[PDB]
Design a protein around this ligand. Structure first.
Ligand SMILES: Cc1nn(C2CCN(CC(=O)N(C)C)CC2)c(C)c1Nc1ncc(Cl)c(-c2cnn3ccccc23)n1
Length: 308
């Protein structure tokens, strides 16, 4: 009279010995538990030791919660791309439960962009990012997204808060779902389907709640706008409800102050009302590849043999 509904986590080849992991600096609190920086032995080829981020579930959490955490985190096991944050191992044996991730020392891109805003202290400050630096970020994000699309995924929440920034300033698609609870006001719940990033969503997505790679491209345009405004709220001064109506009826974000023409042109291609007229992520990269740093050819999905 029924199918069993019991969820489990099955230890696999990603399991790492607890003795190989040490945790130091606290990075923050996730929905599941605390996240730390640390060091992991033997998790990267040719590296005796690697700096890592360690997501934890402590001894007080329920086993149901524990298993949910492990199965959610495990989605990242399928990916191996320079521009997607890597999962490096799992400690499911004993407690606390650990998931070991590539460390992104400069944080999420929204936080990073906001950190570049001048302080209200009249001190000397780095000028806003150059076109060349913004283009580099764009290409890296687009490469990670092309990789995900090639692996038949739709992201559904592409936004600066869901990209991460490495020590060397490389931007990558972030660990899935790790910042939505922190930037809670970037979401709006209107019904079933729950909390949706309405200010990042395409007109067609706002209309019927379906997401495609075409709507990921729309969101990519909004990310470029975020980069150019240092992460202002899109459609600031419109309520959540007013955004739905504005975008569905054809309204667009304005060209940011001092935004280079090239970048806004790219935004406009992403924001074509008809999804079929938007470029693909591969086509986006093709258009800016001459402006990418030379090493992009060695590490990108775009130039890899997997891009066929
Ligand atoms: C995303 C991020 N944030 N940070 C820090 C945060 C503290 N400061 C912010 C600031 O401005 N300070 C003045 C302190 C520097 C940046 C660092 C190193 C990271 N890297 C990183 N890499 C990989 C992962 Cl999987 C995670 C991560 C996942 N879930 N999760 C939940 C909470 C926190 C992190 C994470 N995080």
């Amino acid at each position: 009279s029924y199918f069993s509904a019991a969820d489990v986590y099955v230890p696999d080849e990603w399991e790492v010995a607890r003795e190989k992991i040490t945790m130091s600096r606290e990075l923050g609190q996730g929905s599941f538990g605390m996240v730390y920086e640390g060091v992991a032995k033997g998790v990267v080829k040719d590296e005796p030791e690697t700096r890592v981020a360690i997501k934890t579930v402590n001894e007080a959490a329920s086993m149901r919660e524990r298993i949910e955490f492990l199965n959610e985190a495990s989605v990242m096991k399928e990916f191996n791309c320079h521009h997607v944050v890597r999962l490096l191992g799992v400690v499911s044996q004993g407690q606390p439960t650990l998931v070991i991730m590539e460390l992104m020392t400069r944080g999420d891109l929204k936080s990073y962009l906001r950190s570049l805003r001048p302080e209200m202290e009249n001190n000397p400050v780095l000028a806003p990012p150059s076109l060349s630096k913004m283009i580099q970020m764009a290409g890296e994000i687009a490469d990670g997204m092309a990789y995900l699309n090639a692996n038949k995924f739709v992201h559904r929440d592409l936004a600066a808060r869901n990209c991460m920034v490495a020590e060397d300033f490389t931007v990558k698609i972030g660990d899935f779902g790790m910042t939505r609870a922190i930037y809670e006001t970037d979401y709006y719940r209107k019904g079933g389907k729950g909390l949706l990033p309405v200010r990042w969503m395409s007109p067609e997505s706002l209309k019927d709640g379906v997401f495609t790679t075409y709507s990921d491209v729309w969101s990519f345009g909004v990310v470029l706008w975020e980069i150019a405004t240092l992460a202002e709220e899109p459609y600031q001064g419109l309520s959540n409800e007013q955004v739905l109506r504005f975008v569905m009826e054809g309204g667009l974000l304005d060209k940011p102050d001092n935004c280079p023409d090239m970048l806004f042109e790219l935004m406009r291609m992403c924001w074509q009302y008809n999804p079929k007229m938007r470029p693909s992520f591969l086509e986006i990269i093709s258009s800016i590849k001459e402006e990418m740093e030379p090493g992009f050819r060695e590490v990108s999905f775009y130039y890899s043999e997997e891009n066929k």
